[PDB]
């Protein structure tokens, strides 16, 4: 009833426009054989409704994972994706989305000895997609804990504001490690959503209906 008024050309609207169009360009549509006109328009609309919304899902996962990754770089906060269940559940749910899409394409029917190892390489990416994010968010924070525990002992044992350069040379290293944490917090969201587009767009291929009759020449 009473929704808020939005300025046109806001910075979040521009940013989310660029983000959504980026993730929508990962699984582009297929250019048909016939030229696109009013004859081919229901076939194009129908192909656009038999394609999964991987653009919307991928920017959903990109936005939630980059916000949970950048929570771990604000003070007094831990990343939610440094939990095993959170990050690994996002990974298993992307893999289950790709599998449910691929199962509903054929029949909801589950598919030599070369193919079960292809299956245990396909069922591993449920584990891999989640725990890459989880171990990347956990390992930098763990190294940060350890190396600032080693960086606190030398101003503990020596004087405060005395013998400065041995603490300066480890505080520069801690600063570089939190900068690497920012880079990893952006790149792992990017890698997760690129891989979600890849895994779901493996099964995002249907039959273009097209014209079954024509008036040629």
């Amino acid at each position: 009833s009473s929704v808020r008024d939005v300025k046109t050309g806001s910075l979040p609207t521009n940013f989310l426009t660029g983000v959504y169009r980026f993730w929508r360009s990962q699984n582009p549509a297929e250019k048909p054989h016939d030229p696109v006109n009013d004859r081919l328009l229901p076939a194009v609309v129908d192909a656009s409704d038999k394609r999964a919304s991987i653009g919307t899902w991928a920017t959903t996962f990109f936005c939630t994972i980059i916000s949970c990754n950048l929570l771990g770089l604000m003070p007094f906060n831990e990343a939610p994706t440094s939990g095993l269940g959170f990050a690994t559940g996002l990974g298993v749910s992307v893999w289950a989305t790709a599998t449910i899409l691929g199962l509903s394409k054929t029949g909801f029917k589950f598919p030599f000895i070369f193919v079960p190892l292809e299956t245990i390489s396909y069922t591993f990416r449920a584990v891999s997609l989640g725990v890459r994010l989880w171990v990347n968010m956990l390992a930098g924070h763990t190294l940060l804990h350890i190396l600032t525990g080693m960086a606190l002992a030398l101003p503990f044992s020596l004087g405060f504001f005395s013998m400065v350069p041995a603490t300066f040379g480890v505080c520069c290293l801690l600063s570089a490690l939190v900068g690497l944490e920012y880079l990893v917090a952006v790149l792992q969201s990017g890698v997760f959503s690129i891989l979600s587009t890849v895994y779901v767009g493996e099964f995002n291929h249907d039959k273009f209906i097209g014209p079954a009759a024509k008036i040629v020449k």
């Binding site: 606190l152 030398l154 400065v164 300066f168 600063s175």
Partner: protein, 97 residues
């Protein structure tokens, strides 16, 4: 004051033009401003570690020390390794202090 506006204008002044890169001189010793903020960062970290160590100093460290001692303690619960021994040593040290 207005509790929305005065500190807003004060922080606008402090952020934008109350710069201690020139009001404390500091061009004569540093090369750029990208080197000043890179050193202001590590200076902020060193000030933070010194302030948070000094604000509660007589404590047994949770972090693994390298077998060193802060000041004239050297055998105290500040320098102990097993935590129950330092726990009871602090329990006897606290009644005297």
């Amino acid at each position: 004051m207005a509790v929305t506006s005065f500190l807003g204008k004060a922080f606008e002044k402090y952020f934008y033009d109350f710069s201690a890169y020139e009001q404390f001189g500091l061009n004569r010793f540093l090369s750029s401003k990208g080197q000043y903020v890179a050193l202001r960062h590590v200076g902020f970290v060193m000030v933070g570690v010194n302030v948070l160590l000094a604000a509660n100093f007589p404590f047994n460290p949770p972090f693994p020390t390298i077998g060193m001692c802060p000041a004239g303690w050297e055998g105290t619960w500040v320098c102990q390794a097993d935590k129950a021994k330092a726990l009871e040593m602090y329990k006897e040290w606290k009644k005297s202090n």
